[PDB]
């Protein structure tokens, strides 16, 4: 929420705390980061549309900052100066080595390790469109999304961490609470992604 109610809730729940608010702040921030590193991506982590321009003869394109994983039913889009566009395809490096030396429009790419590579290599500067999942520390919206939605996970995990530090039993209980909450949010993600889609074969 407003980052204050959360702190006072943490203080009240774990035994009417008075002065550990500094440790509260330090360890709380840590929580948001930890959760982000975890295999799951909630919807409100999704970044807005991005674009980039790359110079001629440079088939290597570095990863966008704060990137984690691309959007599944989204894909890399090539935008031309005439307003016309196209969506490039993805293949493993191996499949795509063949084109080494074919000039023209870009068509494919590979994730590789940290840099994007397009084997159809243009001879001029060119613009790209991209979408991906980004950390909250690196998004351009004013407020941190995590506080607003899923506060509870955030309340619990910091407490689980805070309580586990002092070697206290209830650590397992709070960890179970956090696990239940995470399963709930994982269900809720699919609740929205496939909310009202209509499908038919072809």
């Amino acid at each position: 929420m407003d980052k204050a109610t959360l702190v006072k809730t943490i203080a009240y729940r774990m035994g009417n705390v008075k002065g550990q608010d500094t440790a509260i702040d330090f360890e709380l921030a840590l929580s948001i980061e930890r959760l982000e590193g975890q295999e799951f991506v909630p919807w409100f982590l999704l970044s807005e549309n991005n674009f980039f321009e790359g110079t001629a003869q440079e088939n290597r394109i570095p990863v966008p900052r704060g990137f984690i994983r691309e959007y599944e039913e989204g894909s890399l889009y090539l935008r031309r100066v005439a307003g016309t566009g196209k969506c490039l395809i993805k293949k493993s490096q191996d499949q795509l080595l063949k084109y080494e030396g074919m000039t023209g429009e870009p068509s494919h790419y590979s994730l590789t390790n940290q840099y994007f590579r397009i084997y159809p290599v243009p001879q001029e500067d060119f613009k790209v469109e991209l979408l991906f999942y980004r950390k909250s520390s690196t998004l351009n919206v004013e407020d941190n999304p995590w506080y607003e939605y899923a506060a509870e996970l955030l309340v619990a995990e910091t407490i689980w961490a805070m309580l586990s530090a002092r070697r206290d039993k209830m650590a397992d209980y709070w960890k179970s609470v956090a696990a239940d909450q995470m399963r709930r949010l994982t269900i809720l993600d699919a609740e929205r992604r496939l909310a009202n889609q209509e499908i038919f074969m072809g």
Partner: protein, 521 residues
């Protein structure tokens, strides 16, 4: 994984023991906090009494010529004074009293007549003239150290006239008339009953032969007895304990039914037939080794009849004036000790003060209405021998007061337990501490009857071989909260408690913890 410890098993001030093995509630280092039945208490606070000497206050004393009268004498260089009505001074001997005497006089009580003796001046007594004067037939050549009293026998002293100040005693009196010294005193002449006796011994008999209904006894450096049952030459010179010697003149034995004795070596209690140290393994070491007094004298002890306590004012090394600034307190009703810290002070005694406004009243009226006989006041405290302290840095004296405030400033209080018995709790309710297992704190909660806040400091230490190190925690007002949170881990556990409060009532406390490793260093 928690230990609750309480402070009403009534252990004393115990710094000499192995501090880690101290039982529950034992004190490592104390600051003028009183251990009582209900728990730790504050024994401090002082009202301002009405007496005023307007001169140097070295020795003070209380006496009365009649019921309802209160008189005090303040003695100094060249000077002794009076404290009565609203005028002082003008009681000292005719000449300048003697050459800059200071903390070297003495006062004794015999019947109703007040007696004073000084090292550098002949003894003068007070009579109806209001001027201290020498004894009637005592020759002028004499000069005296210390004087004492006994059954109808004044001047049970031990110093000769001059050139022989070393080892003496003379039965100066005869069967005296109550209220006046015997008409003669002659010892060598066989007119009646008097004489001079050596009482051989290595040491010098220093002061009064003390007290006791059956007889009085004292020592040069081994105790000696006096008993007047015989008739040929009355009294029977005899001795009791060779070993025990006493260090200071004002290191006096108490007037209690039991005798409270302080020695060079130890602190012993007896009444003539059986002896024992009051606190051998508990208090003996710290009292002497707090500092080499190095000003052996000016260490005096008085009694507190109201509450079963006795105070031994002793110098602090930090103190440099030679003033005690500190006092050792022991309870005679129950074997518990306590220690106090105070402002610099010179001497103390007990008595009473009855002062009020008197001659400036409004109605000049006739004697058919009641004065009320000087009505009102501490009429209750007239039975109460409240103590009076000659504080070095004040013109007016003060008396103790339950509210722990000096005059308008407040007096400090510190409570320290260096280490706690914390760890495995066995079959018995009381726990036993395991050194091998290093441990982490969880929380602290204190049982207190008051409402005023108290600050808390936390100490930590690596190993027992290591020293102690300190940390401070913010206080908490007991009204709203009883717990404080902190995180730390050390070898042994230390908390330091300080309080600037009107009243402090400590009852018990509980500590939560967990075994999370073993000893490293």
């Amino acid at each position: 994984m928690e230990v609750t410890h309480k402070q009403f098993d009534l252990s004393g001030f115990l710094p000499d023991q192995a501090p880690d093995t101290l039982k529950s509630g034992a004190i490592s280092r104390g600051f003028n906090v009183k251990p009582t039945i209900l728990g730790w208490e504050k024994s401090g606070g002082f009202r301002e009494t009405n007496t005023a000497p307007t001169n140097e206050k070295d020795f003070i004393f209380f006496w009365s010529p009649a019921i309802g009268d209160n008189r005090w004498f303040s003695g100094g260089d060249k000077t002794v004074q009076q404290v009565e009505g609203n005028v002082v001074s003008d009681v000292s001997r005719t000449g300048g009293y003697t050459a800059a005497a200071a903390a070297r006089w003495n006062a004794v009580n015999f019947n109703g007549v007040l007696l004073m003796n000084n090292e550098l001046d002949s003894p003068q007594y007070l009579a109806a003239s209001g001027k201290l004067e020498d004894f009637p037939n005592l020759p002028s050549n004499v000069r005296f150290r210390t004087v004492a009293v006994y059954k109808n026998f004044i001047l049970g002293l031990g110093v000769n006239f001059g050139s022989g100040f070393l080892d003496d005693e003379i039965y100066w009196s005869h069967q005296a008339d109550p209220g006046t010294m015997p008409p003669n005193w002659d010892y060598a002449n066989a007119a009646s009953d008097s004489g001079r006796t050596p009482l051989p011994s290595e040491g010098y008999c220093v002061t009064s032969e003390e007290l006791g209904s059956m007889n009085i006894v004292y020592k040069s450096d081994s105790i000696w007895t006096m008993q007047l049952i015989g008739g040929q030459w009355i009294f029977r010179f005899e001795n009791k304990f060779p070993g025990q010697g006493i260090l200071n003149k004002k290191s006096v034995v108490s007037f209690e039914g039991k005798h409270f004795v302080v020695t060079q070596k130890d602190i012993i209690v007896h009444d003539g037939y059986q002896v024992r140290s009051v606190a051998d393994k508990r208090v003996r070491n710290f009292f002497f080794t707090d500092m080499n007094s190095d000003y052996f004298e000016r260490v005096f002890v008085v009694k507190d009849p109201r509450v079963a306590e006795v105070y031994v004012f002793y110098p602090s090394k930090n103190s440099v004036d030679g003033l005690c600034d500190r006092a050792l307190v022991w309870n005679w009703r129950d074997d518990v000790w306590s220690l106090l810290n105070l402002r610099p002070l010179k001497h103390a005694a007990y008595g009473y003060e009855i002062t009020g406004v008197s001659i400036t009243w409004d109605n000049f009226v006739g004697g058919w209405e009641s004065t009320g006989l000087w009505q009102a006041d501490e009429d209750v405290a007239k039975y109460a021998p409240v103590l009076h302290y000659s504080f070095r840095d004040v013109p007016k004296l003060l008396a103790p007061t339950p509210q722990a405030l000096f005059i308008d400033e407040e007096i400090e209080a510190v409570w320290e337990r260096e280490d706690i018995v914390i760890g495995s709790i066995s079959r018995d309710g009381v726990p036993y501490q395991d050194y091998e297992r290093n441990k982490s704190v969880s929380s602290i909660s204190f049982d207190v009857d008051t409402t005023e806040p108290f600050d808390v400091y936390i100490g930590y230490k690596g190993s027992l071989e290591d020293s102690v190190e300190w940390e401070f925690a913010g206080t908490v007002n007991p009204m709203e909260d009883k717990r404080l949170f902190c995180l730390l881990t050390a070898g042994l556990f230390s908390m330091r408690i300080i309080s600037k409060a009107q009243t402090f009532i400590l009852r018990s406390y509980k500590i939560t913890y967990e075994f999370a490793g073993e000893m490293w260093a």
